[PDB]
């Protein structure tokens, strides 16, 4: 798992303990925790393999962030906040919510001001409410002067260098995530390179490599939950998803100042530790490097995923209706390829 | 089936009788037998539905053909002749025989002169041999002067008009087929429009429409038997091909002077009647009409087949190896689309 709980500086005791981690049916090895100066870490990023960097100072300035400081300086723009009656926040692509009407979301998005979120947070706390929230907002110009000072204080010199070394595309956005303890963003993968910077609280991150596609069972590309796993990690349906019993993960727990590199196309499960208080994180999404001129065989796992994704995309276009993708695909393999 | 056996002119009795037809597990309706002057026949071709035309005079000149006449005038070019130890002649695409080495053909092609074929035919006849032959050769310039007179005598005015009316492409070839009684070309489909002209002997033709794809189970596109059914019509494996129990066919028996229109992408099973003597046929293959500018939805069955075929073609190219088409496709649908 995440190895023995790290000890805080100043003999402040274990940062967190096992009882704070949820229980799952699969085994996991620990993700490496190295210094950005360590050549081994530079080797893991270059080979698009996860690695937790402990000293980057990527978001040094934000480490002082907490609800009061942000409400005070985050500005007056709107902030997306998802609601849930469960600890699981499954993502829903609203634009895709037309292809599937027999579908109803378990997480509602709601725009609101920062002070409204903090207060909404506080009400629940006192009235003993089981309801949960998760703020997920892209950072944009409409933020306070102090926050703009912090942002500019991030270690751009180090990250822009990584950007350069890996050939990545432009930085597409910085997502700010503030969630309640126990909150869980279920397994899924993103089509961008991600430098996950922990600011406040502790988060358990379980990753699975691209070649684990067959064990994770993503929803159909045209479905609102495209890029997410259909497997309930709390109650896995082995009859529908047999290969989930063969899934092996990479795990770790990040805290204030840790930067987790989540390679593009790598599956991730993120959970804010139980009873650890709220959590704050800011991610850095970069477009992947362009496809090389000469294709090398055998193809990489992530490339096959890219292919399967396009097949489903073209088929949905060609048939004129995503609902026909399934029946055509089955007809194509039944008694022919299976 | 093929309706009541037609009666020959001059009270020559039934042309053929039921006992000459093999037995199969599926039901069939009879293909329509109309006059080329009948508007209903023009309606069936326009809607790409089979129809047997009785008066076209398409190959009037060849009706006098028989082994002696051809050996005498067919010329001295080479003639492809397939050998078989069974009554079934499954087609094999030699260029594709590298992607599958765990494969060995049941029909051998052998080049030879026409007189060699006739004599090979005769030897078997006397020595009681169970071995079977099937001559299948494209007609080309290296043929006799008399045969060139016949060919030119075909009813080009009628067929070139059909070519025009349907928007078809150029005539790609004329296949000459001479086979022994009992010979069977198993179910498969061609990517061209076909006007099947019977010259000598009787042939039973069982067709299945394009939408029957799911019940016929064609081999993978990269396999040597691409475009053929994996179902043994004599011993159907219902465990591997369950939907074959839902197959319904269109049937008929053509004789000297009948022209069967086999629409492109329509499945066909051809069998020379048992104990009816050798059979002679000449087909006319035309490229289909180009794809219309505006695509109309819902898509036609044959169009979906075209799509499935391309998917398998691109996937085989993209993965760098046709052997990986299957595993990628299964991985794409297991627990996702099925």
């Amino acid at each position: 798992g995440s190895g023995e709980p790290r000890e805080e500086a100043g003999a402040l005791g274990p940062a967190w303990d096992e009882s704070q981690l949820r229980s799952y049916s699969f085994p996991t090895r620990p993700i490496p925790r190295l210094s950005q100066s360590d050549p081994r870490a530079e080797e893991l990023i270059e080979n698009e393999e996860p690695v937790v960097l402990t000293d980057t100072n990527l978001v040094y300035p934000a480490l002082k962030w907490d609800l009061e400081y942000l409400q005070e300086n985050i500005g007056n723009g709107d902030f997306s906040v998802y609601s849930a009656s469960t600890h699981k926040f499954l993502y829903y692509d609203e634009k895709k919510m037309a292809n599937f009407q027999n579908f109803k979301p378990r997480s509602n998005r709601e725009e609101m001001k920062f002070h409204e979120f903090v207060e909404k947070l506080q009400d629940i706390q006192q009235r003993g409410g089981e309801e949960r929230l998760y703020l997920q907002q892209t950072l944009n110009d409409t933020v306070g002067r102090k926050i703009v000072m912090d942002f500019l204080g991030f270690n751009w010199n180090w990250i822009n260098k990584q950007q350069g070394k890996r050939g990545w595309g432009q930085l597409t956005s910085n997502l700010l995530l503030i969630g309640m303890e126990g909150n869980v963003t279920p397994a899924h993968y993103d089509e961008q390179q991600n430098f996950f910077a922990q600011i406040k609280g502790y988060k358990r991150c379980i990753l699975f490599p691209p070649d684990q596609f067959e064990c994770l069972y993503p929803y159909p590309v045209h479905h609102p939950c495209d890029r997410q796993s259909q497997v309930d990690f709390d109650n896995p349906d082995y009859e529908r998803f047999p290969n989930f019993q063969n899934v092996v993960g990479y795990e770790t727990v990040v805290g204030p100042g840790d930067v987790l590199y989540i390679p593009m196309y790598w599956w991730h499960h993120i959970e804010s530790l139980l009873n650890g208080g709220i959590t704050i994180t800011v991610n850095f999404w970069y477009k992947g490097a362009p496809t090389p001129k000469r294709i090398e065989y055998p193809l990489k796992a992530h490339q096959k995923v890219a292919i399967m994704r396009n097949i489903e995309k073209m088929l949905g276009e060609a048939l004129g209706n995503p609902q026909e993708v399934g029946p055509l695909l089955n007809t194509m393999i039944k008694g022919r390829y299976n | 089936g093929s309706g009541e056996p037609r009666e020959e002119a001059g009270a020559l009795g039934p042309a053929w009788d039921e006992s000459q037809l093999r037995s199969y597990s599926f039901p069939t309706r009879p293909i329509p037998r109309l006059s080329q002057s009948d508007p209903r026949a023009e309606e069936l071709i326009e809607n790409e539905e089979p129809v047997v035309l009785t008066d076209t005079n398409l190959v009037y000149p060849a009706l006098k053909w028989d082994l002696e006449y051809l050996q005498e005038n067919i010329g001295n070019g080479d003639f492809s002749v397939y050998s078989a130890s069974t009554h079934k002649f499954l087609y094999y695409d030699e260029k594709k025989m590298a992607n599958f080495q765990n494969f060995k053909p049941r029909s051998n092609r052998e080049e030879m002169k026409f007189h060699e074929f006739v004599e090979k035919l005769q030897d078997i006849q006397q020595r009681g041999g169970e071995e079977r032959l099937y001559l299948q050769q494209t007609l080309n310039d290296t043929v006799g002067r008399k045969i060139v007179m016949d060919f030119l005598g075909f009813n080009w005015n009628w067929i070139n008009k059909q070519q025009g009316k349907r928007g078809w492409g150029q005539l790609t070839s004329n296949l000459l087929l001479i086979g022994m009684e009992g010979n069977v070309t198993p179910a498969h489909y061609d990517e061209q429009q076909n006007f099947f002209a019977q010259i000598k002997g009787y042939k039973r033709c069982i067709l299945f429409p394009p939408d029957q794809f799911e019940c016929l189970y064609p081999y993978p596109v990269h396999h040597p038997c691409d475009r053929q059914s994996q179902v043994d019509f004599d011993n159907p494996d219902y465990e591997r091909f369950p939907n074959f129990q839902n197959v319904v066919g269109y049937e008929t028996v053509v004789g000297p002077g009948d022209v069967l229109y086999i629409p492109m992408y329509w499945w066909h099973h051809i069998e020379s009647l048992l104990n009816g003597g050798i059979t002679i046929t000449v087909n006319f293959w035309y490229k289909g009409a180009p794809t219309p500018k505006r695509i109309e939805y819902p898509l036609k069955a044959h169009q979906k087949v075209a799509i499935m075929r391309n998917i398998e073609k691109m996937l085989g190219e993209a993965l760098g190896n046709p052997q990986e088409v299957g595993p990628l496709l299964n991985t794409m649908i297991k627990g996702r689309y099925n």
């Binding site: 997306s80 993502y91 829903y92 692509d93 609203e94 998005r109 997920q136 892209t138 597409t172 956005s173 997502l175 963003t185 899924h188 993103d190 089509e191 961008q192 495209d226 890029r227 999404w285 477009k287 992947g288 496809t291 294709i295 490339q303 890219a306 292919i307 994704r309 396009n310 097949i311 | 691109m314 996937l315 190219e317 993209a318």
Partner: peptide, 15 residues
């Protein structure tokens, strides 16, 4: 062809 199949989107878990 294959390069086109290879080409990827940039969809993230963000509405």
């Amino acid at each position: 062809v294959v390069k086109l199949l290879l080409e990827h989107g940039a969809d993230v878990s963000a509405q």
